[PDB]
Design a protein around this nucleic acid. Sequence first.
RNA 1: GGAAACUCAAAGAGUGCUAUCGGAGUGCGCGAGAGCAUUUCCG
Lengths: 377, 103, 482, 166, 461
Amino acid sequence: SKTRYYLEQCIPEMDDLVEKGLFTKNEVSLIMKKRTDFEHRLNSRGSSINDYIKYINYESNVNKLRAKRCKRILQVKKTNSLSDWSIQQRIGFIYQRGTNKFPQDLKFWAMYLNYMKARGNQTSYKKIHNIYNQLLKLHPTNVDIWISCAKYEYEVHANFKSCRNIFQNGLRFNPDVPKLWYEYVKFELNFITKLINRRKVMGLINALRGDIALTIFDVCMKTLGKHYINKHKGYYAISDSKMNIELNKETLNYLFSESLRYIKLFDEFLDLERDYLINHVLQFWKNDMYDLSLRKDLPELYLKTVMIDITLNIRYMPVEKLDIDQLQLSVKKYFAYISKLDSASVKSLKNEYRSYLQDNKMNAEDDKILDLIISKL
Amino acid sequence: IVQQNRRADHLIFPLNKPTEHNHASAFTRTQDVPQTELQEKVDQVLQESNLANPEKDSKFEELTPEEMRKRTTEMRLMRELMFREERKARRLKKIKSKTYRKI
Amino acid sequence: ENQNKFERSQTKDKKLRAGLKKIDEQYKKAVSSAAATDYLLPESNGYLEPENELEKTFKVQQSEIKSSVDVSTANKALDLSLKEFGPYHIKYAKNGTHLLITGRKGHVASMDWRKGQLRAELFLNETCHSATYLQNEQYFAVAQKKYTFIYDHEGTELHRLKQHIEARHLDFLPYHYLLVTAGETGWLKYHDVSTGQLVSELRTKAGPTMAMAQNPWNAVMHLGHSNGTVSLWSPSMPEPLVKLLSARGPVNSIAIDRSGYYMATTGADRSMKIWDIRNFKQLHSVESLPTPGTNVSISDTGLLALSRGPHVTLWKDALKLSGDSKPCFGSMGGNPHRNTPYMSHLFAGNKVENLGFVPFEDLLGVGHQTGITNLIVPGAGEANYDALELNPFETKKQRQEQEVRTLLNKLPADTITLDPNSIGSVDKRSSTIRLNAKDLRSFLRKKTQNVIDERKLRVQKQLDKEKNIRKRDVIEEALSRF
Amino acid sequence: PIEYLLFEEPTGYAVFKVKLQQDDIGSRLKEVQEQINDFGAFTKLIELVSFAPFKGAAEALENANDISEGLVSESLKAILDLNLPKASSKKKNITLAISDKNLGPSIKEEFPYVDCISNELAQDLIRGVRLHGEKLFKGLQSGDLERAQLGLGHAYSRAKVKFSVQ
Amino acid sequence: MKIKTIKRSADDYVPVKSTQESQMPRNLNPELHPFERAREYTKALNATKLERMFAKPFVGQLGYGHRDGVYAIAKNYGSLNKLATGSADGVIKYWNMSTREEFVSFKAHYGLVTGLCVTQPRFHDKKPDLKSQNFMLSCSDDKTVKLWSINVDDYSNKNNEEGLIRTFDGESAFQGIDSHRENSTFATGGAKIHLWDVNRLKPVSDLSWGADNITSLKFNQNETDILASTGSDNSIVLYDLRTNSPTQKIVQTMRTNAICWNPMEAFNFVTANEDHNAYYYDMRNLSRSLNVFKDHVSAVMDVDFSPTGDEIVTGSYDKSIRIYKTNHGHSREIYHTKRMQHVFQVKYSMDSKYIISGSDDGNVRLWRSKAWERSNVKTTREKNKLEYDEKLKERFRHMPEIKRISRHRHVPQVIKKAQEIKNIELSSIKRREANERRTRKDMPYISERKKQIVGTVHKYE
RNA sequence: GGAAACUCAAAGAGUGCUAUCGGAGUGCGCGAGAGCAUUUCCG
């Protein structure tokens, strides 16, 4: 057998564990017969990850009990012997064996990764890189793997070159999820904000705009459009004019539903040239794709683009007198678009009136003005 | 070398240093050229303004009353916004300094 | 700490010095890494301790030990009391699973006992002396009236034996698949139960065999005659391999420890002897026992048991080399340097017929007139069996696997000397300094052959004469050289 | 020298590390070429180390067309760039047991440090992994192979015929 | 009073479910395992009987063989399954031994082919394209040494220059070659030994002692710049290309046919000559043949070391091949078949398990070296059983009955009768030597390891 | 004579089941360790 071999390999830790008096022979034979039964259950014919989990629970609890009897009997923390790292070495062996014998359960993979991230003070990040790279190899599709240990590599070690490297590798591996693109934009903005805060810390002790996020936004837009189209039309390129045009309208709808989420959790981020990259988004959504949709379908979408382009300024201030001061720009563009629209003019009027109602003295008189007087007086 | 080759007890025949290379991790770009169009565009943006540890060491080569309690948020901000290679070199240099001043 | 149990009992050439250092270092490392297994041994043995001075260990009987013992062992403590056939007799199997009982009238029953699975009962109408299993539940031999029979596992009479003119002492040598018979005529014969061949017919020449035991460690057979001679035999030499003078008169019982080191022997002159075997030293005698103990057996831990007919007396740790562990019968004068009976049981009026320790549990089976009784004894069973040879949790598949493996590893019958470590040596022609040759018309054909033979004889004589030649007063001094 | 193997499957691309090696000189013997048939010895010889499924149906058809003309594509190049180590020039260059000599030069053109190989050893190793099929993949998928290959076959046939569906 | 009794408890011994495996509890006591030595002895005897039951050494032919018996075989050294055979009517062939077929054939010369070897020949005006085509070169007795490419599908990197890359031509004939495995140099033998490299049509150097022909050569396997040769002055010569000169010369009692270096010692070689024993020399003290393998009946036509560095394959002029170990000096075991005659070239393969023998009937047969170890990858308990009972046979090989089972073969009747009469002749001549030594006084105890040397230039240092 | 297989035993075939000192530093090897080994922070 090999169960005899694993049990015989775990004997010197109990040897010095009885040689130092913190475990007598009766209870160490008790834990050894319990580990014998657990290990045969582990190396059965058709075992289970539940068996791996509860054997790991047994080893962690006997490690906690060994530390407790060490701080109670010998009154020292580290016994500088074989008795200390042996249980963590065995837990590492059990997690490696479980990830070899059962590689499809991310609950067990995540328990291994959390245990190793906790024991990073004793065994450093090379084992983290090894088991995470083999996890990436065995599951390239599941984007939460890339997102999780990119968060690890950014929040525990903060190595931005390798972080952007694994985001670009995962984005090459599956450029048809929205979540990976959007959280790559989120990480890229976190890096650019930390860099500008480094520059501000330099200025405190006394070029690099959002073009990275805008280029990956553009590649996000065209690639998610193409792969949404290929998620539809499964095997045969559907060939009739109205069906092709209506599916182009459908992917325009889904793509703009992604772009508005970009605008949402960028407006939550802003702290930067926010109007610059928001106007880059809206210049792209002025220069449309497959249909040039301003006079074509989705006129409510065209109204929402006009509404964002008008209300670009108003979304930032609690001191609304500055909004009234610069509102000549907003109402000037508003008149420039009311002069172009007719019933979308009416819906845009209701939208701008609701925005000013959500908003609410010399400028409130001179530079609607009824609400400006009602908020000034 | 043939004499101690006939005193050893078991001879495992990969004798010389064999091909033992670590696998291509996802953290390291292999052939050091942009493959995809995204790598193309991001590197043709980041050709100009990158913190390739020079500005990191220049802006992190700073860190007493400030050591005790006066800069209790400024030192936290500096050690937080320190990057990876700058933080590793700072840890090694401070550990060597404490090894010199505390033996 | 335990390496005495696991122990197995200056040169010129440099490579041979290094090789000798490698092999005795490997010996030391393998003995240590074998001795470090009893940490992983599954359970611990049992004991009853006095824990006081008034609480003697032999004022404890079956009622209180069966009260404070486990339910499974208490239900193992059987009593298969049968009365319509005669004074019964026990033989457990090699592993502790099956039991084989034998009445002196006609009864032979081979049966599980921890399960109620009577798998071969057979009555007969002739006096069945003793019985024993062969290798398994499958085949069991009974020493009947005047022909030994062997039987299949359900009860079909497999074989009468044409030899074994009678039989009253019969058992098995397990690894060799040997059946050993000693009878009331002066014989001892070996019959292999695999090939079916007889192996040897050793004429005993010492009267009828009064008792017999088997050594497990080297598979020699220990006869005990009416001369008081304990002889040890094996089918190499037709003579007895050694002899011993154990008791005076006849010896009624003899029993060997499973490690082959110790021999208990009880005669008919109210005498017991304890013997070493590997040194043949009479270790200590025991006199003054009231009746001649008819049957002694010995546990797997050193806990021997006399059986004096009504009494059964178990002594713990009465096989050391000291003069303290001499088994006595009563603490007199305030003497804690004796060895009292570790425990004892007294049956009513029925003479105990034979003992036998259950192999891997804590109980001593004893068979008497009215049947069977097992006795719960805490230290008298080896706790931790080794599953590659004996196994009380068999199945059909692994039982057949052990059958085919042991039939493939049948040791040949010549290989049982007095010491079975002696098949690796050189053959008594050692030459520790080895001389390796470096440091020293049909009448007419017959007549010419005789001529060439006589010339070879003359050349041999001349070479030996030359070898002996190479390896070897005044007036007569003047009158020399003539 | 066969230490990585590439298998293509109608749910996704698989790459197998070759743990130990096959007997090269006796590779026509009965007692060697029954080991490919039985399962208890093939997983001694080949383990799964990467399996990336193309998930789009049309992207599966496009990968199948690019393989069927013998050309690299995005997902294949992606998983080889991930899995294949940079064997540095001091040691060797890495080897890769692919199924066809038409595909061979098109990966040697793109990756320099790889070296494709298809002798009869790669042929019957790929034959063994094709025979054992799903039982190698140990559950890293959602969907069996035969219905997916039925759909992919019908699509590849219609894309070859350019059959008018009007 | 405190009592206790052992508790089987029936759960840590028999399982809870059905599918999990039952316990094998374990006690390593020499009490409970009584007969140690007799039981492992009987396991050794069953090991010997099962080895004789599985002693099935022959694995196959390859192709339909050549025309008229081989006379040169060259294994390659980089790859495993590629092997060149040159045979008598000028026919060289380059076999892929995996499918056991030939890549290409060539009518290589007119007369007898004499020797071939493969090279990875680094040209200077060309990259070594040695991962798509493989190069072998062959010398015959019609004064030509041809160097050839071979198209080979070992890889699949590319997509044509099939044969006869070039032809070196010599003054006299040629008798053998071998290629220096570094820097594209190769040496030949003929009237006198020559050293070429593949950028010249003329010989770069000439390296004889005197005007005496040279039957065979061999380079090293490491410390490559020295080499050895054998000429029909019954002589072993060594040479060193670093000094570019011959360096020592011994003369034995009969002509050395085939020499072979050791690929793990780098200063030991075996030497196969017409007296029926392969000598095994140490280089830096050529006064004593530090072993002599002494079991044939006829001329020892070829030898080679296995690349594991301890086994010798030999093939005799009588129709038999033998495998020796280095450390013994007698035959481990012997192959033969009825359909092979006069094995002329034997070579270990680089796998160190398969010996390629080439007869004079035409075939290039193959054999397993260990005649019972199969080639499949085995499960770990089976590998444990095989290595354990092989170690038992190795430990108990001196017992007489398993010696008389492990020793005997079916040696063919010709070899058995002729070895029997050779043995009675040797016993008779030893008896007459004992009589003569019984008389005389100045008679040296002549060592068997120095019996065959009858002269050494650079006598002693 | 038909057989309930749920009493049990001995066996025969077919099917499915597994692998082979601790983190750094320090003399170190071609962004880099797979190891040689410590008084350097040490634990």
